[PDB]
Design a protein around this nucleic acid. Structure first.
Ligand SMILES: [Ca+2]
Ligand SMILES: [Ca+2]
Ligand SMILES: [Ca+2]
Ligand SMILES: [Ca+2]
Ligand SMILES: [Ca+2]
Ligand SMILES: [Ca+2]
Ligand SMILES: [Ca+2]
Ligand SMILES: [Ca+2]
Ligand SMILES: [Ca+2]
Ligand SMILES: [Ca+2]
Ligand SMILES: [Ca+2]
Ligand SMILES: [Ca+2]
Ligand SMILES: [Ca+2]
Ligand SMILES: [Ca+2]
Ligand SMILES: [Ca+2]
Ligand SMILES: [Ca+2]
Ligand SMILES: [Ca+2]
Ligand SMILES: [Ca+2]
Ligand SMILES: [Ca+2]
Ligand SMILES: [Ca+2]
Ligand SMILES: [Ca+2]
Ligand SMILES: [Ca+2]
Ligand SMILES: [Ca+2]
Ligand SMILES: [Ca+2]
Ligand SMILES: [Cl-]
Ligand SMILES: [Cl-]
Ligand SMILES: [K+]
Ligand SMILES: [K+]
Ligand SMILES: [K+]
Ligand SMILES: [K+]
Lengths: 57, 96, 100, 87, 98, 84, 55
DNA sequence: CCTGCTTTTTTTTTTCATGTGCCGGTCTCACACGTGCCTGGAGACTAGTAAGCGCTTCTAGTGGCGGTTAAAACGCGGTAGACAGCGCGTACGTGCGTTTAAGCGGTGCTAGAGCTGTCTACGACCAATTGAGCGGCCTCGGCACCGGGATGCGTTTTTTTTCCGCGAT
DNA sequence: ATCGCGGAAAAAAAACGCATCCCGGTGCCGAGGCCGCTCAATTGGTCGTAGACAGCTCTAGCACCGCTTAAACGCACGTACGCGCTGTCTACCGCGTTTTAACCGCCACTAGAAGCGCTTACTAGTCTCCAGGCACGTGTGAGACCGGCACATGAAAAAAAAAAGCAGG
């Protein structure tokens, strides 16, 4: 799963971000590692709907 | 028949009689007390086990118990518990 | 006519996109390192740290805070707001069991 | 021999912009001004809790130097297991 | 005739169940539920009665505590009425839910 | 072989209210009772699954209180009073 | 603490409620046992203020 | 706008009645405690090795320097979000009359929990042998970082369509 | 419903500006892999015991009964709360200018992590022995329950007093 995330970002080498993207996009791995912090992993892109531009409309 | 299940009940009674000589305890309450002592026993023993493993020691000593207590108990409780433990070990080593 | 000026919300949204795409520590390293030393003085005087111990600490802190800000955001949205307030933080920590 | 040592008010070097960035990565769009000092409080408590246990591990090993492992063991105790620094 | 206003019995109930320790779900219906659920994992299962009482004690304690948190989420939204969105925010912040 | 099924509705509206009341809840949406039943179901599913796993491991056809205690401990819902 | 709680209720015997009252009313024991269900303990009386009527 | 006023809203308060702590009989079962007696802790021994100790090696932690420039700090301006009112519709609380099935105490049956003794397959331990995996060391392509150009998109002002919205029919 | 005609509001294109995306060029260090050597896994063997099994006892789990009545159910009513819509007002965002100190790359000085070899004080082990703690079992007093009790608090009421509105002037 990480290898595939690396391939997306056009990288030969897996880095901690790729592991994090792998794990947090997988229902099951995310549950297995629900209480685990991956150094240098970041978080998944996620902007709540209400926060997106609605504005004058 | 014979089908023995150890428990801490007689020791919970002994302590109860020091602290409140005229009060008793229901069997469910005694059950809870039993659960409690096995729980904390396991928490202390486990953290101790770990301490010694992390430090490449084969032996759980009173020093692993003490450190484990500082890790597991909240502040004031940890102070009194360390005191009672230290007291007990001092009193014991002075009796052979 | 004027210089360009984006509307309130827009650059905020852009900053969210920027920081969610990246993984670099967002707290300046030296100020954090000093803060770690300072706090450690309360428990034991004259400590050394491995530099990776300070990195470990900073990595763990930022993950925690980023974690808490997600939950805090939800609490604010739950109250029909878009602005996080201290009471949102307190509700999230209370529900997490970090406070009574 | 007696060394350097500083007990500044370093908490302020966790600045407003740095906190704004942390919130950003957490998906927050808008922030009350009361948040920044509140976040410093929380951060301080978090670090106090982790540092206390890490130094407890340090003292036990009869070392003067806190190691990554002490931090890692501390974070695992606090239910905040960390990957990447050993263990 | 005499009539309490909406909420006054509710508080009266609260004071009563907070004073007491007895189980609040009826035992036979709970026991069938337990058996029914267990069926899916393994057939022809027997239960010690104490095992069923253990599960019932644990479910109720969980639910009561979940309702404490749910109540705070309702109040956080300037309501006095708990709703599903309150339980869902609670479970999410607890980490039970995605 | 036992007669069975859909006993989740035997978790009554009043019983759910009583639980909420012990949790200090004063007013209750109509949608709560069915949401709660869902939650309750998941909670028992998780606990029982684990209790039954300990039972099969022990090669027993009877779920014990200890099996439940151990399962509850694994799920971080440590229970005192049942042979812990 | 539980024996004290028993005596307030004019009871000779400690029951699980007395242990519960004991533990939940003591800040540190409550922390030590924050993730523990005491069987037949119930909960502390506690009603959020907004839910009370204006007196 | 102006008395008046008048008519409701709030009030204030008592009291009137509801359901809740309190009390004194009386009943029963579970705590408590005595009695056997099995197991597991203790006393006294030997043998072996975990770990404290002293000492030496050399890792990596600490501190100090100066210059660059990215980042923090601060004020100005004003958009839009927080927040307080309020008014409207009905979802929930309450209570009462009807219906359901939990709880209780009991008997009867037997699955299966749990125990015992025996036999043996399987794991610990040991000593000799050697190849997997370590630390150390060199290399060169992936990746970071740059500038340039492409393109996606936010914002505002001037332009076309839309959805009303008023009565007058 | 139907005109009619604006009336407002709303969506349109369009034109402009600013940020992000993505390229190749340049450059360099960290992944990849090769090497030599040590020590941890393997081989072959012996030895003691864990646990699977057959067989047994008897616990407690399951099924059923037929009482009693508490609890769940459904139904009606109407209060109070969820929730939408408006208006207000300043907290917060965006941005430009000024100020601060993090970052970098490198060094120099040495505390202290860490490794080794040496010696003994502790612990695992085992036999003998016995008393502390277990299961059984019996008794009586604590606690549950019941009727009446009495003492809280909220709702219902009149008596009264302060604000919504019309009404008329
Ligand atoms: Ca040393
Ligand atoms: Ca008392
Ligand atoms: Ca205390
Ligand atoms: Ca009066
Ligand atoms: Ca009496
Ligand atoms: Ca007695
Ligand atoms: Ca007796
Ligand atoms: Ca050694
Ligand atoms: Ca030496
Ligand atoms: Ca200025
Ligand atoms: Ca608005
Ligand atoms: Ca290598
Ligand atoms: Ca590079
Ligand atoms: Ca660029
Ligand atoms: Ca170029
Ligand atoms: Ca290569
Ligand atoms: Ca509202
Ligand atoms: Ca509505
Ligand atoms: Ca305001
Ligand atoms: Ca620089
Ligand atoms: Ca030296
Ligand atoms: Ca005896
Ligand atoms: Ca006994
Ligand atoms: Ca009784
Ligand atoms: Cl707040
Ligand atoms: Cl909802
Ligand atoms: K060092
Ligand atoms: K059985
Ligand atoms: K075998
Ligand atoms: K020693």
């Amino acid at each position: 799963l990480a290898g595939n995330a690396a391939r997306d970002n056009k990288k030969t080498r897996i880095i901690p971000r790729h592991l994090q993207l792998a794990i947090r996009n997988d229902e099951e791995l995310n549950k297995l590692l629900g209480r685990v912090t991956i150094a240098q992993g970041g978080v998944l892109p996620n902007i709540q709907a209400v926060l997106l531009p609605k504005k004058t409309e | 028949k014979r089908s023995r299940k150890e428990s801490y009940s007689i020791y919970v009674y002994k302590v109860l009689k020091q602290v409140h000589p005229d009060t008793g305890i229901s069997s469910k309450a005694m059950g809870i007390m039993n659960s409690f002592v096995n729980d904390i026993f396991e928490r202390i023993a486990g953290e101790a086990s770990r301490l010694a493993h992390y430090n490449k020691r084969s032996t759980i000593t009173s020093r692993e118990i003490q450190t484990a207590v500082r890790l597991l108990l909240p502040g004031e409780l940890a102070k009194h518990a360390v005191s009672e433990g230290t007291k007990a070990v001092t009193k014991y080593t002075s009796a052979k | 006519k004027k210089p360009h000026r984006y509307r309130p919300g827009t650059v905020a949204l852009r900053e969210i996109r920027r920081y969610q795409k990246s993984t670099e520590l967002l707290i300046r390293k030296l100020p954090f390192q000093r803060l770690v030393r300072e706090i450690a003085q309360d428990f034991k005087t004259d400590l050394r740290f491995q530099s990776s111990a300070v990195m470990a600490l900073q990595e763990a802190c930022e993950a925690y805070l980023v974690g808490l800000f997600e939950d805090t955001n939800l609490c604010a949205i739950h109250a029909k707001r878009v602005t996080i307030m201290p009471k949102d933080i307190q509700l999230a920590r209370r529900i997490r069991g970090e406070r009574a | 021999k007696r060394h350097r040592k500083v007990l500044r008010d370093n908490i302020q070097g966790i600045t407003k912009p740095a906190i704004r960035r942390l919130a950003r990565r957490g998906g927050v769009k808008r922030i009350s001004g009361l948040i920044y000092e509140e976040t410093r409080g929380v951060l301080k408590v978090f670090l106090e809790n982790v540092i206390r246990d890490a130094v407890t591990y340090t003292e036990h090993a009869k070392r003067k130097t806190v190691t990554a492992m002490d931090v890692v063991y501390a974070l695992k105790r606090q239910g905040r297991t960390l990957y990447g620094f050993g263990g």
